[PDB]
Design an enzyme around this catalytic site. Structure first.
Site, PDB file in Angstrom:
ATOM      1  N   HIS A   1       1.220  -1.419   0.093  1.00  0.00           N
ATOM      2  CA  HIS A   1       0.259  -0.017   0.216  1.00  0.00           C
ATOM      3  C   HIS A   1       0.840   1.492   0.207  1.00  0.00           C
ATOM      4  O   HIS A   1       0.547   2.178   0.065  1.00  0.00           O
ATOM      5  CB  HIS A   1      -1.021   0.032   1.418  1.00  0.00           C
ATOM      6  CG  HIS A   1      -1.048   0.089   2.096  1.00  0.00           C
ATOM      7  ND1 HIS A   1      -0.273  -0.775   3.457  1.00  0.00           N
ATOM      8  CD2 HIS A   1      -0.198   1.628   3.217  1.00  0.00           C
ATOM      9  CE1 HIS A   1       0.564  -0.455   4.849  1.00  0.00           C
ATOM     10  NE2 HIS A   1      -0.103   0.946   4.581  1.00  0.00           N
TER      11      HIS A   1
ATOM     12  N   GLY B   1       4.783   7.013  12.311  1.00  0.00           N
ATOM     13  CA  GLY B   1       6.095   6.643  10.996  1.00  0.00           C
ATOM     14  C   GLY B   1       6.013   4.671  11.127  1.00  0.00           C
ATOM     15  O   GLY B   1       7.024   5.032  10.691  1.00  0.00           O
TER      16      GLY B   1
ATOM     17  N   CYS C   1       4.619   2.004  10.443  1.00  0.00           N
ATOM     18  CA  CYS C   1       4.065   0.973   8.976  1.00  0.00           C
ATOM     19  C   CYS C   1       5.348   0.084   8.634  1.00  0.00           C
ATOM     20  O   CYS C   1       5.881   0.742   8.046  1.00  0.00           O
ATOM     21  CB  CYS C   1       3.220   1.538   8.203  1.00  0.00           C
ATOM     22  SG  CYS C   1       1.958   0.927   7.243  1.00  0.00           S
TER      23      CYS C   1
END
Ligand SMILES: COc1cc(C)c2c(Oc3cccc(C(F)(F)F)c3)c(OC)cc(N[C@@H](C)CCCN)c2n1
Ligand SMILES: COc1cc(C)c2c(Oc3cccc(C(F)(F)F)c3)c(OC)cc(N[C@@H](C)CCCN)c2n1
Lengths: 301, 301
Positions: free
Chosen positions: A41, A143, A145
């Site tokens: 993603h 931050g 992910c």
């Protein structure tokens, strides 16, 4: 005396963490040999996330749309492909800090360490369990992910998890390093619901054993139980049913403490029925389910 | 959503840990440049520990009485000396993995990460606070002696702690890397008592702020308090008195949450007076005091 929730030493993973940027989307990648693994993603804008066609979005991207930074070193992307939900960026340089590693898929109730990272930079390490409903109660999403979960066996990093998303309820979900989700979740901005989150019974018993090894004995009663009778009570309080295999893995803690597994089950039965009456166990007012039997054995020799 | 007790990434410390053996006594050492730092009681037998004369015991030892192993590599000892309670073994080889480091002495209530080691081998990492009475509720004592505590700032490991002993009550005590004990403790097998262990008030307030940032708001009331009125209540429940400096360091969490520091103090006052009525905060039934304001700010951006 002492019983801490300990993470695995993180050094072998620290040397694999990179920043991956695609436009305004930055997240964490894992750099093993000449491949960077990250959530697919990264190729989506916040608008793309409603119903992305990942194959078409990926086709539109070229190598030079991916900015990979390892510390302050820019890695050249020479290939981009998708394996289920993880992006794989082939780079021109093999990670010279690459440890001995495997990719494993863990079971609900198993524990691992997360190296929490901010934009490719290690921030912190914690120990957690894969909830029975395949969600993770993770660190504050900052931050974060693409941060990975791992166990260490001997000299080998077993990578078991990568963070992909927060559910609308604020719990974390993600995939194995083959990019298959844990649980029924999808990397799209859809209202997604988790199954009901049960307490990991075998982990609670492992922790009562840790408590006894540490000289906490107030909750030991004179009763025993049958597995069957215990499991009737357990189900009523949203505890996973205890299995013979789970009794089997508690055997070493039984042997060391002099407390038969079904006797510890009869203690747990009463703790569930009567509460703690304002006492604590290993400094906790709640029963803890984030230690496996193997975690308790590791820490207690 | 998410709030985990996170340790610092441990990699820079992992590469400094060694085994130090003197006869049948093995413990952990820290190898920085050409010096190995470890508890001086490595030169004592379990019998020597009652009333050791460390200067005379040390004089009796030669270089070759110290077996230092880094992984499976034997380091040659070329010098042995004592700085307060820490042994310093000069070795023929500078640690090529030596990080940028400092030695600091921390304050009661400050947090740090422990790299728990077994006989020179990293086992696990956890985050803890220096209790107000200068003891550490540490991990299970299993080949653990000489394990170090540290913070990371930017690129620098600030070494603040080394484990020397368990007190008869099973809490841990130790020294800065200059070998000065935290608290009134001595490295001898004497019945040694700690002062009364107070709750770190500013840390509890920092954690209530973490809870609010995570959308836990049930414990916010409509009251405020004066520092003076809060501190009357605090002292009755064995909480450290809150100071102006402590109000000052909570300012950024106040600003971010829209909750004035003295308003959070009035919430805490009521939690102390009334208990939690069987509710939880960030999944805890007890007020947590092992996050500094700075820890909450680190994790919440
Ligand atoms: C990659 O998956 C992520 C990661 C985070 C942290 C997200 C976040 O929450 C954050 C909250 C605080 C701080 C942060 C930040 F530090 F990361 F910036 C994120 C969100 O809500 C604000 C919304 C998300 N959904 C996508 C639409 C993002 C862009 C498409 N790849 C997020 N997606
Ligand atoms: C160096 O300071 C230490 C460290 C530990 C773990 C100790 C321990 O407890 C342990 C309990 C379980 C497992 C372990 C072990 F794994 F370490 F073996 C130790 C003890 O009680 C048994 C007694 C101690 N006192 C000294 C007399 C030891 C020798 C002189 N340097 C200990 N001293």
């Amino acid at each position: 005396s002492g019983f801490r929730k300990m993470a695995f030493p993180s050094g072998k993973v620290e040397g694999c963490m990179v920043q991956v940027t695609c436009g305004t989307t930055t997240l964490n990648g894992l750099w093993l040999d000449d491949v960077v693994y990250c959530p697919r993603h990264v190729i989506c804008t916040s608008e793309d996330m409603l119903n992305p066609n990942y194959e078409d979005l990926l086709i539109r991207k070229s190598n030079h749309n991916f900015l990979v930074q390892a510390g302050n070193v820019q890695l050249r992307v020479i290939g981009h492909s998708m394996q289920n939900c993880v992006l794989k960026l082939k780079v021109d340089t093999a990670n010279p800090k690459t440890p001995k590693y495997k990719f494993v898929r863990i079971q609900p109730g198993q524990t691992f360490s997360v190296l929490a990272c901010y934009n490719g930079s290690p921030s912190g390490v914690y120990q957690c369990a894969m909830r029975p409903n395949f969600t993770i109660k993770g660190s504050f999403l900052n931050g974060s992910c693409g941060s990975v979960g791992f166990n260490i066996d001997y000299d080998c990093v077993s990578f078991c998890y990568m963070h992909h998303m927060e559910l609308p309820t604020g719990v974390h979900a993600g995939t194995d390093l083959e990019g298959n989700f844990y649980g029924p979740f999808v990397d799209r901005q859809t209202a997604q619901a988790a199954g009901t989150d049960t307490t990991i019974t075998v982990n609670v018993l492992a922790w009562l054993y840790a408590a006894v090894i540490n000289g906490d004995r107030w909750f030991l009663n004179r009763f025993t139980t049958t597995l069957n009778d215990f499991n009737l009570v357990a189900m009523k309080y949203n505890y996973e049913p205890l299995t013979q295999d789970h009794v089997d893995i508690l055997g070493p803690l039984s042997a060391q403490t002099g407390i038969a597994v079904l006797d510890m089950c009869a203690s747990l039965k009463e703790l569930l029925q009567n509460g703690m009456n304002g006492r604590t166990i290993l400094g906790s007012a709640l029963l803890e389910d984030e230690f496996t039997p193997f975690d308790v054995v590791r820490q207690c020799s």
